[PDB]
C-alpha cells in the first residue's frame, strides 16, 4: 500500500517552497492575453513592450501575494486555518480598498 | 432648411387680437385687409368651437388682394389642433376616380378622429447584451440597461431576442422599446462608448444617456381622418393607398358603416370628433356637377367648414353655357357667405414690401423702398415683390451691401410688368402668333 501524507503536510511543504523562490507564479502567455484584453477596452491597436507586461506581472503578483498575507491574518484572527472570501473583503476594506 | 423662402413665408397667423377679434393694423405678417381679417377670425373662432357644421365661406376679391394670404393665416393660426385640407379645384379632375368621389375624399380628409392611448416604453443605454444562440438560436439571453438614475437587468423572451438581433443591438446603444409591440428603435450611440463603435464613420453623432426611470407610460394623442379609416377598410393594405393613391371609388356602404362606428366611439367616449377645414382655392374651376354635390355634402353632420377663394367676376360657369357672379351658380351662392378683399393703399404696399424685404435677406435703402412702392402702385404688388429678389441679385453682382435705386431700375428695365408685357404684345402682333394662327417671320 502506497504512502499518503496527512492533510496539511504538503501545504506546508508548498509554503516553504514558494516562500523560498522568486520566479513568477502566474503563467506568462495567459497574463499577456489578460493585459491585452484589458487594454482593448481603453484603446485599440495599443502595443505593449515585453518589459511592459513583465513589469506588470511583477506588480500584480506582488499585490496578490501581499493581499493573501493580509487575508491569512484575517483567517487566523477568526481562529480559522482556512481563508475565505470575507477575509479578502475584510483585508481590502481595512486597507481602504473595498 | 428644406423650406425655402416662398410667397407666403412671412404669414405667421391672422394678426388679430384674440381677446376681441379686433384686427391690429399690422401684426403676424398681415397688413390691412382688416374687415376681411376680422371676418376670417370669426370663421376661425367657430372652426375651433366645432359646434357648427358645414358652413361655406367665399373669399372674393381682385387678384393679389390677399385671399390666399388670409387662408394661409387661418391655417397658421389653427395649427395641428384642427385638420386643414387645401384643395386646388383643378385636383378633383382625376383619372382614377369621378370628381364627386375625389370631392368626397376631400370632405372626409377634413374630419379628425382624436384617439388617446398609452403604452409603457422602456428606454436606456445598453450596458450589456448576452445571447447564447445555442444549431438554432435565440435560446436565452440577458439585457442590462441603465439611465443616469437606475440600472436593471432583464431575462429576455425568445421573440425579444429575435428583435434584439434583428436591430443588432449593441453595448452602448441608446434604445427605446415599446413593450406591447416589442419594436426597438436605436435613438443613438452613447458618447462614453464611442471607442467601441470601430465600424462607425467619423460622421457619426453621439448622445448623452437617457435620464430618469427606465420605464414609464407615454401617452400618444392620435388624430386620424375619416378618409384614412375609409381607405384602410377598402382592401387588405388599404392604408398603402393613402400614399400611392390608387384608391378606387370607395364603396358608399363602407363609409356608412364607419360613420356609425365613429358615432359609437364618440358615445362610448373612446374617441372625439375634431371637425377641420377644407379650403378650395379658385373654386370657380369646379363645374356644375361638383356644385350640386357640394350643396348636399354640406348638409351632412360630418361636414367641415369649407372656405373658398375666387378671382372671377360675372363669368361663365364651367360645364354649362351661362354666366353668374364669381362663376358660381346662384343656388350654390345661396349657401355661402362672402368676405371681400379690397385693393391696397400705397402705404400698405410699402408695409407689405417691407415685410417681404425682411423675409428675404434684403436691405432696402429708403429711396429703393419708395421706388418699389411707386412700382407697386403702377405695376402691382406681386411684380414689385419680384423686383426685391431681382434687385438683391443685381446689387450682389456689383457687390453692394444694400439695394439702391440703380438696382431697382435695372430690375424694372430687365423684367417687364404685365401691362408693359401686354403693350409689347399689342405692338408685336405681326411677329406674335395671333388667335388666327397667322404670323409673319420676315424682318
Ligand atoms: N394683407 C397682406 N399682408 C401681407 N402680405 C400680403 C397681404 N396681402 C397679400 N400679401 C402677399 O402678397 C402676395 C399676393 O397676395 P395673395 O394672397 O397671393 O393674393 P391672391 O391670392 O388674392 O392672388 C402673397 O405673397 C401674399 O403673401
Swiss-Prot record, chain A:
GO terms, molecular function: cadherin binding; DNA binding; protein heterodimerization activity; structural constituent of chromatin
**How does the record describe the protein's post-translational processing?**
Acetylation is generally linked to gene activation. Acetylation at Lys-86 (H3K122ac) by EP300/p300 plays a central role in chromatin structure: localizes at the surface of the histone octamer and stimulates transcription, possibly by promoting nucleosome instability. H3R2me2a is present at the 3' of genes regardless of their transcription state and is enriched on inactive promoters, while it is absent on active promoters.
Q: Provide the positions where the record notes the PTM Phosphoserine.
A: 21, 50
Q: Which cysteines are joined by disulfide bonds?
A: none
Q: Which residues carry this modification: Phosphotyrosine?
A: 5
Residues where N6-(beta-hydroxybutyryl)lysine is found: 20, 43, 86
> Where, per the database record, does this protein carry N6-crotonyllysine?
20
Membrane-spanning parts = none
Chain positions found as N6-methyllysine:
1, 20, 28, 43, 86
Residues the record lists as N6-(2-hydroxyisobutyryl)lysine modifications: 20, 28, 43, 86
As stated in the Swiss-Prot or TrEMBL entry, residues carrying the post-translational modification N6,N6,N6-trimethyllysine are 20, 43
Provide the positions where the record notes the PTM N6-lactoyllysine: 20, 43
For this entry, list what GO says about its biological process.
chromatin organization; epigenetic regulation of gene expression; gene expression; nucleosome assembly; telomere organization
Residues with the modification N6-succinyllysine, per the entry, are 20, 43, 86
Q: Which residues carry this modification: N6-glutaryllysine?
A: 20, 43, 79, 86
Residues with PTM N6,N6-dimethyllysine: 43
Entry-annotated residues carrying N6-acetyllysine: 20, 43, 79, 86
Instruction: Name one cellular component (GO) term.
Output: nucleus
Its main subcellular localisation, reduced to a broad class, is: nucleus
Which residues does the record list as Phosphothreonine (modified residue)?
44, 71
- Assembly state and interactors? The nucleosome is a histone octamer containing two molecules each of H2A, H2B, H3 and H4 assembled in one H3-H4 heterotetramer and two H2A-H2B heterodimers. The octamer wraps approximately 147 bp of DNA. Interacts with TONSL; CHAF1A; CHAF1B; MCM2 and DNAJC9. Interacts with NASP; NASP is a histone chaperone that stabilizes and maintains a soluble pool of Histone H3-H4 dimers.
Query: What's this chain's function?
Result: Core component of nucleosome. Nucleosomes wrap and compact DNA into chromatin, limiting DNA accessibility to the cellular machineries which require DNA as a template. Histones thereby play a central role in transcription regulation, DNA repair, DNA replication and chromosomal stability. DNA accessibility is regulated via a complex set of post-translational modifications of histones, also called histone code, and nucleosome remodeling.
Give the linked disease.
Glioma: Gliomas are benign or malignant central nervous system neoplasms derived from glial cells. They comprise astrocytomas and glioblastoma multiforme that are derived from astrocytes, oligodendrogliomas derived from oligodendrocytes and ependymomas derived from ependymocytes. The mechanism through which mutations lead to tumorigenesis involves altered histones methylation with gain of global H3K27 methylation, altered Polycomb repressive complex 1 (PRC1) activity, aberrant epigenetic regulation of gene expression and impaired differentiation of mesenchimal progenitor cells.
* Similarity field: Belongs to the histone H3 family.
Q: What is this protein called?
A: Histone H3.1
What is the organism of origin for this protein? Answer: Homo sapiens (Human)
- Covered residues of the complete protein? 38 to 135 of 136
Amino acid at each position: 500500500k502506497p504512502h499518503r501524507y496527512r492533510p496539511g503536510t504538503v501545504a506546508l511543504r508548498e509554503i516553504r517552497r514558494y516562500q523560498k523562490s522568486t520566479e513568477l507564479l502566474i503563467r506568462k502567455l495567459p497574463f499577456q492575453r489578460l493585459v491585452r484584453e484589458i487594454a482593448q477596452d481603453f484603446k485599440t491597436d495599443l502595443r505593449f513592450q515585453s518589459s511592459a507586461v513583465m513589469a506588470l506581472q511583477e506588480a500584480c503578483e506582488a499585490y496578490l501575494v501581499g493581499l493573501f498575507e493580509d487575508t491569512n491574518l484575517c483567517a487566523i484572527h477568526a481562529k480559522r486555518v482556512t481563508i475565505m472570501p470575507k477575509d479578502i473583503q475584510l483585508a481590502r476594506r481595512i486597507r481602504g480598498e473595498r | 432648411g428644406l423650406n425655402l423662402i416662398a410667397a407666403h413665408s412671412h404669414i405667421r397667423g391672422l394678426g388679430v387680437d384674440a381677446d376681441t377679434l379686433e384686427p391690429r393694423p399690422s401684426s403676424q405678417g398681415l397688413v390691412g385687409q382688416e374687415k376681411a381679417r376680422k371676418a376670417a377670425a370669426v370663421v376661425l373662432e367657430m372652426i375651433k368651437q366645432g359646434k357648427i357644421a358645414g358652413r361655406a365661406v367665399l373669399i372674393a376679391g381682385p387678384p393679389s388682394t390677399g385671399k390666399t394670404a388670409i387662408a394661409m393665416g387661418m391655417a397658421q393660426s389653427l395649427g395641428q389642433d384642427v385638420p386643414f385640407t387645401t384643395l386646388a379645384a383643378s385636383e378633383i379632375f382625376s383619372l382614377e376616380m369621378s370628381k364627386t368621389e375625389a370631392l368626397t375624399q376631400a370632405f372626409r380628409k377634413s374630419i379628425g378622429v382624436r384617439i388617446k392611448e398609452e403604452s409603457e416604453i422602456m428606454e436606456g443605454e445598453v450596458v450589456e447584451i448576452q445571447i447564447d444562440r445555442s444549431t438554432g438560436g435565440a435560446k436565452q439571453g440577458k439585457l442590462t440597461i441603465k439611465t443616469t438614475d437606475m440600472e436593471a437587468i432583464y431575462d429576455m423572451g425568445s421573440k425579444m431576442i429575435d428583435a434584439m438581433t434583428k436591430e443588432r443591438v449593441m453595448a452602448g446603444d441608446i434604445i427605446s422599446i415599446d413593450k406591447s409591440s416589442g419594436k426597438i428603435t436605436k435613438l443613438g450611440r452613447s458618447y462614453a462608448r464611442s471607442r467601441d463603435y470601430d465600424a462607425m464613420g467619423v460622421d457619426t453623432k453621439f448622445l448623452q444617456c437617457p435620464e430618469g426611470e427606465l420605464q414609464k407610460r407615454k401617452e400618444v394623442v392620435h388624430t386620424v381622418s375619416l378618409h384614412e379609416i375609409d381607405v384602410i377598410n377598402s382592401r387588405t393594405q388599404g392604408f398603402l393607398a393613402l400614399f400611392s393613391g390608387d384608391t378606387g371609388e370607395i364603396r358608399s356602404e363602407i363609409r356608412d358603416q364607419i360613420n356609425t362606428k365613429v358615432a359609437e366611439w364618440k358615445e362610448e367616449g373612446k374617441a372625439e370628433i375634431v371637425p377641420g377645414v377644407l379650403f378650395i382655392d379658385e373654386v370657380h374651376m369646379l363645374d356644375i356637377e361638383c356644385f350640386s354635390y357640394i350643396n348636399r355634402a354640406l348638409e351632412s353632420d360630418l361636414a367641415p367648414i369649407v372656405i373658398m377663394a375666387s378671382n372671377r367676376g360675372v363669368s361663365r360657369i364651367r360645364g354649362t353655357d351661362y354666366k353668374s357672379p364669381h362663376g358660381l351658380p346662384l343656388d350654390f351662392l345661396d349657401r355661402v357667405v362672402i368676405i371681400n378683399t379690397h385693393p391696397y393703399t400705397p402705404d400698405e404696399l410699402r408695409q407689405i414690401l417691407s415685410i417681404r424685404a425682411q423675409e428675404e435677406e434684403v436691405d432696402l435703402t429708403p429711396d429703393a423702398l419708395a421706388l418699389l412702392t411707386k412700382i407697386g402702385q403702377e405695376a402691382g404688388l406681386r411684380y414689385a415683390s419680384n423686383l426685391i429678389t431681382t434687385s438683391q441679385l443685381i446689387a450682389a453682382k456689383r457687390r453692394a451691401k444694400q439695394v439702391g435705386v440703380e438696382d431697382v431700375q435695372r430690375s424694372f428695365k430687365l423684367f417687364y410688368d404685365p401691362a408693359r408685357s401686354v403693350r409689347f404684345v399689342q405692338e408685336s402682333e405681326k411677329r406674335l402668333i395671333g388667335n388666327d394662327g397667322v404670323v409673319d417671320f420676315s424682318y
